[PDB]
Design a protein around this nucleic acid. Structure first.
Lengths: 284, 289
DNA sequence: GAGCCCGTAATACAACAGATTTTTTCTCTTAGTTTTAAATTTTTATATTTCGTCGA
DNA sequence: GAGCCCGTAATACAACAAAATCCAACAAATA
DNA sequence: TCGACGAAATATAAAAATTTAAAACTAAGAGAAA
DNA sequence: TATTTGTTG
DNA sequence: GGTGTTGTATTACGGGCTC
DNA sequence: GGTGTTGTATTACGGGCTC
């Protein structure tokens, strides 16, 4: 993904569908972490209704409205009622394709870290983890990461409130005292965190693309989709033959995907990331 | 849900409205106002049993009329058989139901600026349209055009402007888009010829046109005198209850109508079989259903 | 070094790791219900439209 | 070269990849 | 080929009085898809 | 003796 | 427009000593 | 006693030419 802009403008959205239920008021955990600062959040839903915009609004609008939402094609976010709200308000939607959760990313990596944290705080205390969920997000917020090297409080306005001890390169370290000069401090943090995000991007690209062969077609081919995101995710995979027909491509929607003319009723989506294509080649 | 059922109906309304607007060539805000009027119509327990094109045509017309424009009901009814006056009747019914307020004026000056490009066009498009609206502005204040089909008065004013100016065009070709009968058209033309002295008709009409009074509409001439020549007091207003009490509704009053009616209330029974012959001849299968 | 052709031939990389139903909203599609307004008559004076016909 | 301590500090490697039902079938536990 | 008239179509406000859609409104039924 | 209930491809 | 991404043991590279 | 293992595109290394 493109790295960032000013703070709290790109937001990653996903959630795990089911947990061992609490007392019958809460069922699953939704997360909001911004692409820039990776700030944890505690959205505890009920596996939901069209009132998603209520809880989501109450928990991001604490900070403010973003520019784009990096999420999956989930029905609570594909959500024609909710999408028109974003089009009117001025919020884009990346909407990662069917069974390709890699784009969500920061939220997926956070729920990876949240799962370990939730296991740590609810090993002997199942069925009431909603009390510990703010502790989960506060612990995630106070712990520095690796790809940025700073705590997500420090990536934002740096006001780690606990202050058990002063960090290295001891200074005033009290951003409450600063009143008008916060602009230069946020500019400095933005510059160093932007170059750190670029460093994380290039490091990821180096350690991943050692074998990733590119595929650049962009027009006029007869590509396939090998029975993943073509049929249902709930459709069972077995020793049944994989004989998906030769489809067609009409548009280059992105560098790493191509839209297809799915010869079905609608298939409800036509965006296929390159991890399912395996371009078909004919012969006269 | 209750809110779920509204969305499909509104989507169908939007699809039909956009389908008609694709042939009507109306701007976006007119369609937006039409859709909000359709929402108001559904909020007023929308008239069921009506054809879909009627209500969307009424909403489109009231939206295109709320801002001064040029579209006419014939354009709404221009698909090979539509029966325009039924659409007009549905619109008239929806006037009271939707309770239209701040009614728009009926002035044919904007009609000419749209009729100019099709029939009787001009090289600069400044002369004939301005001449027609200039003559129409003063012909309106003479109390002659009152409820007389604004398309017809617009076409008549265009013909008058063509007559006073120089334009080699066919007289009968205007009925392609104007859709006005020739009888009322020539009636309005020679009405203008009667009400004008024709002092400088060949060059250019009079530049100071003032007719204070002095003229009457033709319908006033027809039925003011109510014939052919070739703040009252409340006591002067009697109640009609005494008229109903004058005729007796008594059960025994069955013989007060003897004015040879008693001999001829019904057909005679001697000709009942004679009637029945031609009845079973013709009016026989008309009853078996 | 410096590259090239081509002909063999090693070479890390990934699939086999029980498979299926549910769970919670959403979104077309397609058949059944409900409320309501409308197709042919009297009719009454008013007016304008559009045919329809007639005349010199 | 040759190795060692120590102190940072990079570094590929794998986990988030929806959740949870059983299917068929061994053998323990009562009553 | 301009003038001269006849005449149905509407509104109109009621009472009415049998059939005809007819479009909102529910409600399966499939198909997505984390 | 039928209905359970631990664990495992 | 729209398409990975960090936590984690594990391991590699400079000051200071022996040369 | 008892605990990975090959199919597959992909890529690396010798004879023969130019040096």
């Amino acid at each position: 993904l493109p790295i960032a802009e000013g703070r709290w403008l790109d937001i990653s959205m996903d959630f795990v569908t089911g947990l061992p239920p609490t007392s019958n008021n809460l069922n699953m955990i939704l997360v909001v972490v911004d692409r820039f600062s990776k700030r944890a959040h505690f959205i505890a839903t009920r596996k939901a209704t069209q009132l998603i915009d209520l809880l989501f609004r109450y928990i991001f609008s604490y900070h403010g409205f973003p520019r784009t939402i990096t999420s999956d094609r989930d029905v609570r976010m594909t959500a024609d009622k909710y999408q028109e709200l974003t089009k009117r308000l001025g919020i884009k939607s990346t909407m990662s394709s069917a069974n390709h959760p890699q784009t969500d990313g920061q939220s997926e990596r956070t729920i990876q870290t949240l799962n370990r944290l939730l296991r740590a705080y609810a090993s002997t205390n199942i069925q009431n983890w909603h009390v510990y969920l703010p502790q989960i997000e506060f612990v995630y917020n106070s712990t520095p990461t690796r790809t940025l090297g700073k705590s997500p409080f420090e990536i934002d306005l740096g006001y780690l409130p606990n202050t058990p001890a002063i960090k290295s390169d001891d200074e005033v370290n009290a951003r409450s005292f600063t009143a008008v000069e916060l602009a230069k401090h946020l500019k400095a943090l933005t510059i160093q965190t932007k170059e750190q995000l670029e460093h994380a991007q290039i490091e990821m690209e180096t350690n991943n693309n050692q074998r990733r062969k590119p595929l650049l077609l962009n027009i006029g081919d007869h590509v396939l989709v090998h029975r993943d995101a073509y049929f249902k995710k709930g459709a069972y995979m077995k020793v049944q033959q994989i004989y998906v027909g030769p489809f067609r491509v009409v548009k280059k929607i992105n560098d790493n995907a191509y839209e297809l003319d799915l010869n079905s009723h609608k298939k409800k989506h036509r965006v296929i990331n390159v991890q399912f294509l395996k371009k078909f080649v004919y012969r006269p | 849900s209750a809110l779920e059922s509204r969305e499909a109906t509104l989507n169908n309304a939007r699809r039909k409205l956009r389908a008609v607007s694709y042939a009507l060539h109306i701007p976006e805000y007119i369609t937006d106002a039409a859709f909000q009027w359709y929402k108001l119509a559904l909020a007023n327990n929308f008239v069921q049993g009506r054809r879909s094109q009627n209500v969307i045509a009424s909403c489109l017309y009231v939206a295109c009329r709320k801002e001064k424009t040029h579209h006419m009901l014939i354009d709404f009814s221009s698909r090979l058989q539509v029966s325009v006056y039924s659409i007009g009747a549905t619109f008239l019914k929806m006037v009271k139901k939707l309770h239209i307020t701040e009614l728009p004026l009926a002035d044919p000056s904007l009609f000419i600026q749209h009729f100019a490009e099709k029939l009787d066009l001009a090289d600069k498009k400044i002369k004939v349209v301005k001449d027609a609206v200039k003559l129409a502005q003063r012909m309106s204040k003479d109390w002659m055009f009152e409820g007389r089909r604004p398309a017809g008065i617009a076409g008549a004013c265009i013909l008058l402007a063509c007559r006073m100016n120089n334009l080699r065009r066919t007289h009968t070709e205007i009925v392609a888009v104007s859709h006005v009968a020739e009888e009322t058209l020539q009636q309005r033309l020679n009405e203008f010829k009667n009400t004008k002295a024709a002092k400088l008709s060949v060059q250019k009409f009079r530049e100071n046109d003032v007719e204070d009074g002095e003229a009457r509409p033709p319908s006033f001439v027809k039925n003011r005198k109510k014939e052919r020549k070739i703040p009252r007091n409340l006591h002067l207003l009697p109640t009609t209850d005494t008229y109903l009490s004058k005729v007796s509704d008594d059960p025994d009053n069955l013989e007060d109508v003897d004015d040879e009616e008693l001999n001829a209330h019904l057909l005679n029974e001697e000709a009942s079989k004679l009637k029945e012959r031609i009845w079973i001849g013709l009016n026989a299968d008309f009853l078996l259903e």
